[PDB]
Amino acid sequence: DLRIKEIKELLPPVALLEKFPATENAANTVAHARKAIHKILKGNDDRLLVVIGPCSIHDPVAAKEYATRLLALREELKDELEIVMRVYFEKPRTTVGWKGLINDPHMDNSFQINDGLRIARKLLLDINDSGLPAAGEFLDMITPQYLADLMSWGAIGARTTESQVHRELASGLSCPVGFKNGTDGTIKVAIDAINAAGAPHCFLSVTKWGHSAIVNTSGNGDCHIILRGGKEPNYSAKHVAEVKEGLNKAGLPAQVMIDFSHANSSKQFKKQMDVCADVCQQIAGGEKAIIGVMVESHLVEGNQSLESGEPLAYGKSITDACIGWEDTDALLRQLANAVKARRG
Amino acid sequence: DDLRIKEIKELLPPVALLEKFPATENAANTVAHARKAIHKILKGNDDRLLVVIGPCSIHDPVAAKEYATRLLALREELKDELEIVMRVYFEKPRTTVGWKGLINDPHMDNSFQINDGLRIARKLLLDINDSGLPAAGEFLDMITPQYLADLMSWGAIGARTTESQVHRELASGLSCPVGFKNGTDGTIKVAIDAINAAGAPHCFLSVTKWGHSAIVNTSGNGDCHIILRGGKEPNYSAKHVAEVKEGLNKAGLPAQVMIDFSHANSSKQFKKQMDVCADVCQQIAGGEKAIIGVMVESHLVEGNQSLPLAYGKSITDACIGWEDTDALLRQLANAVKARR
Amino acid sequence: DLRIKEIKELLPPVALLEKFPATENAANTVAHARKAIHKILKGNDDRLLVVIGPCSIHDPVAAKEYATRLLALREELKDELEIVMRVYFEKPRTTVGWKGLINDPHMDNSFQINDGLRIARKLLLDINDSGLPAAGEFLDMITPQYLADLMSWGAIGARTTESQVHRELASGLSCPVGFKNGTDGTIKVAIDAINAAGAPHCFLSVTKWGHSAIVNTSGNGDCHIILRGGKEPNYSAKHVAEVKEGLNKAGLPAQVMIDFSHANSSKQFKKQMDVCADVCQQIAGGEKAIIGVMVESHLVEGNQSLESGEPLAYGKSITDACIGWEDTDALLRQLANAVKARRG
Amino acid sequence: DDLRIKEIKELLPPVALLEKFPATENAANTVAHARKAIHKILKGNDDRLLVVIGPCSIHDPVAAKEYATRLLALREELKDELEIVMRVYFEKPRTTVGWKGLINDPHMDNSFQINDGLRIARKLLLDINDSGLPAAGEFLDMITPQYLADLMSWGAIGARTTESQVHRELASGLSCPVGFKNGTDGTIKVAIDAINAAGAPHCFLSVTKWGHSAIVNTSGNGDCHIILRGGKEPNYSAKHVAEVKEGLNKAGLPAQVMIDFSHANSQFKKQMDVCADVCQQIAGGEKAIIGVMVESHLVEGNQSLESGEPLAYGKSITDACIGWEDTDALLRQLANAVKARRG
Numbered sequence A, C: 001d002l003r004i005k006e007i008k009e010l011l012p013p014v015a016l017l018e019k020f021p022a023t024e025n026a027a028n029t030v031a032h033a034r035k036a037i038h039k040i041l042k043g044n045d046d047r048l049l050v051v052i053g054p055c056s057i058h059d060p061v062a063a064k065e066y067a068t069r070l071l072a073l074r075e076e077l078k079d080e081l082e083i084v085m086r087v088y089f090e091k092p093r094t095t096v097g098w099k100g101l102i103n104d105p106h107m108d109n110s111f112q113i114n115d116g117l118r119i120a121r122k123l124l125l126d127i128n129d130s131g132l133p134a135a136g137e138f139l140d141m142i143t144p145q146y147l148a149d150l151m152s153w154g155a156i157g158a159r160t161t162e163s164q165v166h167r168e169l170a171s172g173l174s175c176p177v178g179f180k181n182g183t184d185g186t187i188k189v190a191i192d193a194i195n196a197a198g199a200p201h202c203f204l205s206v207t208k209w210g211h212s213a214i215v216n217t218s219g220n221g222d223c224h225i226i227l228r229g230g231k232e233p234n235y236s237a238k239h240v241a242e243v244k245e246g247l248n249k250a251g252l253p254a255q256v257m258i259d260f261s262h263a264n265s266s267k268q269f270k271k272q273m274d275v276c277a278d279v280c281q282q283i284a285g286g287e288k289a290i291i292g293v294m295v296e297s298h299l300v301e302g303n304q305s306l307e308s309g310e311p312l313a314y315g316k317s318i319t320d321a322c323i324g325w326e327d328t329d330a331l332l333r334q335l336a337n338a339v340k341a342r343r344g
Numbered sequence B: 001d002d003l004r005i006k007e008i009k010e011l012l013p014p015v016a017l018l019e020k021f022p023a024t025e026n027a028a029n030t031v032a033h034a035r036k037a038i039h040k041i042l043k044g045n046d047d048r049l050l051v052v053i054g055p056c057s058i059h060d061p062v063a064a065k066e067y068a069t070r071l072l073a074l075r076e077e078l079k080d081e082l083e084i085v086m087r088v089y090f091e092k093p094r095t096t097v098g099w100k101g102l103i104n105d106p107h108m109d110n111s112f113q114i115n116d117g118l119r120i121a122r123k124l125l126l127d128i129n130d131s132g133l134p135a136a137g138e139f140l141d142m143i144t145p146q147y148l149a150d151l152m153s154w155g156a157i158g159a160r161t162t163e164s165q166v167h168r169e170l171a172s173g174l175s176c177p178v179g180f181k182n183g184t185d186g187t188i189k190v191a192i193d194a195i196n197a198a199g200a201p202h203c204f205l206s207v208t209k210w211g212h213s214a215i216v217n218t219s220g221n222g223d224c225h226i227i228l229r230g231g232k233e234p235n236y237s238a239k240h241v242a243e244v245k246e247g248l249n250k251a252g253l254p255a256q257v258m259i260d261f262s263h264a265n266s267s268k269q270f271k272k273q274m275d276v277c278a279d280v281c282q283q284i285a286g287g288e289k290a291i292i293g294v295m296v297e298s299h300l301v302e303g304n305q306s307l308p309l310a311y312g313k314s315i316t317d318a319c320i321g322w323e324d325t326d327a328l329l330r331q332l333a334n335a336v337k338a339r340r
Numbered sequence D: 001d002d003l004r005i006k007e008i009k010e011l012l013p014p015v016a017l018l019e020k021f022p023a024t025e026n027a028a029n030t031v032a033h034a035r036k037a038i039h040k041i042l043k044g045n046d047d048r049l050l051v052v053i054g055p056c057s058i059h060d061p062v063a064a065k066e067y068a069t070r071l072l073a074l075r076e077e078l079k080d081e082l083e084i085v086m087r088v089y090f091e092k093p094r095t096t097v098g099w100k101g102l103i104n105d106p107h108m109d110n111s112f113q114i115n116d117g118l119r120i121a122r123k124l125l126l127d128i129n130d131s132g133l134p135a136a137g138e139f140l141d142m143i144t145p146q147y148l149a150d151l152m153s154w155g156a157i158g159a160r161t162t163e164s165q166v167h168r169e170l171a172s173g174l175s176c177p178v179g180f181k182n183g184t185d186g187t188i189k190v191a192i193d194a195i196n197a198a199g200a201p202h203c204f205l206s207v208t209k210w211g212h213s214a215i216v217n218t219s220g221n222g223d224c225h226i227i228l229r230g231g232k233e234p235n236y237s238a239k240h241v242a243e244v245k246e247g248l249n250k251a252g253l254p255a256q257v258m259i260d261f262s263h264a265n266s267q268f269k270k271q272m273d274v275c276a277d278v279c280q281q282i283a284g285g286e287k288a289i290i291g292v293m294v295e296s297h298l299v300e301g302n303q304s305l306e307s308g309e310p311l312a313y314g315k316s317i318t319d320a321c322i323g324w325e326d327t328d329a330l331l332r333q334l335a336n337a338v339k340a341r342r343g
Ligand SMILES: OC[C@H]1O[C@@H](O)[C@H](O)[C@@H](O)[C@H]1O
Pocket: A298, A299, A300, A314, A315, A324, A325, A326
């Protein structure tokens, strides 16, 4: 082990589950949201799943204010929207940068992972306990053991849709799971992923106790595609119809989640509003295959760079740029009205 | 919690397999020598060719040992041209579902006797290395590596996981050199990004030799390289090799490549492997120095079969047989002779 | 494992440490009480260490009511007495019986030890946070990692004083440790234990992660004897003189803690008051060797049987009989008066 | 706080030693048959005598295997009268300090190479059982047994821990029979309590074969008995045996004893005198004596490890033992006393 420079103690998941147990409210929130999303995926509910929130969480105070504002819209638009808050801790990049809230909660490159896990789990508990469901991103096979019991929906990392170990992971998760399409806009890997995750699997994994074990999963039938764009945006009606034809040819439900950001928005946060406009039209004219959307959203629009010896703007992303609260309110109201038009 | 987790069973920790199956002196010397040789080839201070060759997947230790005894003869004969390393792959990534290799399911009956699989796999790897033959594997599983990596002289991150951050992290901490396949579509960038990440230090969650999760800090691995394995069309041609060399130079990496003759470079047809050998041999005989290694899917008997089984025949991808193997290795040795 | 019927999961110490961390005041209570006892054992404080409280804890509610009453007397008498509450979670039996709160918190042979550890640590934390230090018998080889950081003083029981694993345990404990003499009255085993515990040791133990490990200890110089009687009581001046000589002969300071209960009362709880009368007269008369006493004390006197199935009376021991609160108050004032007269 | 904890180092979990040194078929058969034979002697359906004999402590695996081969000859030959089991103890519980034994200090230099020592001790136990000779251990810790107890056909709880609840818990869950030494006052009440305690089921914390702590439940071990080892005076006479028997009957326990010829009942050669008295009792019809314990080595006596001089071969570095010639004689005497008791 000449390339392993140090090994350091890691709190076991049981220690974070005992320090931060789900309240009865928190567990009810997760349970209710997982069932609602399942009913939507089965086609038995016609509401739209909306996953919306910051690119990444770097400040629990701002995240709790965001959650309060979002929860108010969630109660008001519940007839049309199943609103879930995006609670992502890290923005994966090949480029250098902040490794996110779990790795580096103090944002200073100290890799204080035990602190990060405590802060992240406590934030998830508080949001769920307030009544707002949470959506997560699964980047690795160890982190989910500390947090997934507070997640109502998750996304597998776009760079690991094709990976057997991430698919094995999805097949045993208690929540619905979204797989992003290919970076060139094709959907073949994502369909392979939905199929693989829907099968039972046996593989190695760390347990709640911090020990590796052999685990058997049931398979996960609540997996769906996330359209995030290829070279160009792929949110249009032509693209949606192509993806629906692929999903039918593959014997899968012809339903999609559309990610309004990044490639689909051309990497300018404001263009999420344009994607909204298009997708709302598709929903208002009777598109039932669009069962969800994902939006990058924060209190304060835009973004900022993390800098040594310097304070940061409150509520503003330190990773990718997000729409701010005003646009977020308008966007949610637009989608709600679109869901209405489609129904009567 | 755990409504899709059906069962949780005990798993031997790496320390028990390391204690049951300690490296002999001979196995350890084999691994060290082979790592130094591949490092020398990668530093450019050796004109020989790294040849990673053998079954697509191990599924029968007895046939594997016959193949190794046969391959060891040629490794010895062709020492001055080739650094021959046997494919000993215990883990197989599926396009969707299927048999995942000896470790996951040694009895090939969906009994998933992974403690058995680890015992069998380690014993096989130890005997091979102990006979003097170095070994190569794909590192797919995040947990299994600690049971075997000390007996591995070279590793691969598959095409379907080259883009994975956890695999890049694992590579940053391995004691052996590592090849990264190109993407399934043929994309070269993902692999260049993996090489850059694997050479950097990382800090991440992982599992110790005691079976416990821990925080690990790695040093970074400078001995990583790309493996051309094809996309929609093959990418072994001199044109593709030139393009990849220009990409590596742009990325500030050494302009060096290993060429996988199988998978999408052979269009999943085992005989095209000899066709690619012919084409690749020409590049090497004409002075191409950027080709530092190749990989070939080879077995005792050619072709493949579905999962009693036929002896010497692959139960995953189709392989060339022993006779075409001998001929291929001699073709590569001759091309190396000519290059210098 | 033919005689092993079942193996069940156990929360690791870090889980209990994370769920119930020491407050600042709890940690201050432990640090100050250990320092004050060390000062007494070094000869630099003339006050009396008093370890007093229930034979066993079986009910947090009565334990906390008790703690409030004792805290008020610790505050009023602290110029004379260092009062430390008996908070015993583990009981050694002559053959079989209820082993205490941790082993069987619901007192019904359901052995819900994970519950018992949660209950026990929460209670220890509440008592220390209130300002009252706590004493415990260290019987089990695994439980200490869940509690020792909240213990200001520990006892190795008469039945285990001779035990090498218990001496090793003591050699690595952060708190002072008393060794009872043997059940037949033998003094030499406690003297040997003190000497063994003062040396460093290397032995197998379990870590805060719940894994077995090799540990090295520094040795514990804050060990002393506890006189608990034998076939006959051994609290009297004749016996104290013999023990001081025996300690000096073995190169140990002539210092003793006197247990008023167990064999020194012939298991008759009211006689603790007679032991008290005699020891107070020793202390008031000038006996410096008596640096501590121990007393079995509860809200209500006497004891009661678990086996009858009757609902338990409040504040009343289910193990050895104890003096009630009124006797306890009179006893603590007697001891404080004796210490004052010893100084005068 | 951990002020008095200087260092924490890695420990192989039992599964690692079990995987490196698995029981052969022969070792397993030896353990099973010896345990069943001792159960039959304790239930009173075999008239043979349990003989636990061998070095006070094992410090040299080579010498132990030679003694084991020598004793194995005597086992087969006297097998109709005696169930011979080798004493394979790794340490001498020492009043307060000294050489700590093979598991702690296999290299005998205070380097505490416990992982080495566990390997060496499991390998020794495996080889001895595999050859056909059962082995007897002393259970001092609650972690060591997990590495070794499957290769043990009988065990003793140390006299300094007979009273200890945690060692009684351990006994209640052991797969082999267990003896409890008397106290030191030569009294038997703590040992009677230990047999009653260990006979009951318990629930308690223990370390598993995976090296993790867990909650275990046990069934209770009905195969426990007393060992008479003396105190300030020897307790091996027929008078003492009669007192112990009335005490066990009064407590509702089977009236049977094991007599330890050494220690306080002992002067290593006085063990030969205790054999002399014990044989007279057994020949004269004493059924209650179901076993004996004898400290024996290749070479009689003992010797000091803190001298700086090379140790003699096959000679104890702890308590003094009888040597091989006296060992053959004692065993034949016991076989003859058992013959006289029977026919
Ligand atoms: O500081 C929180 C910020 O939230 C924004 O959405 C809002 O426009 C700002 O006025 C400010 O309240």
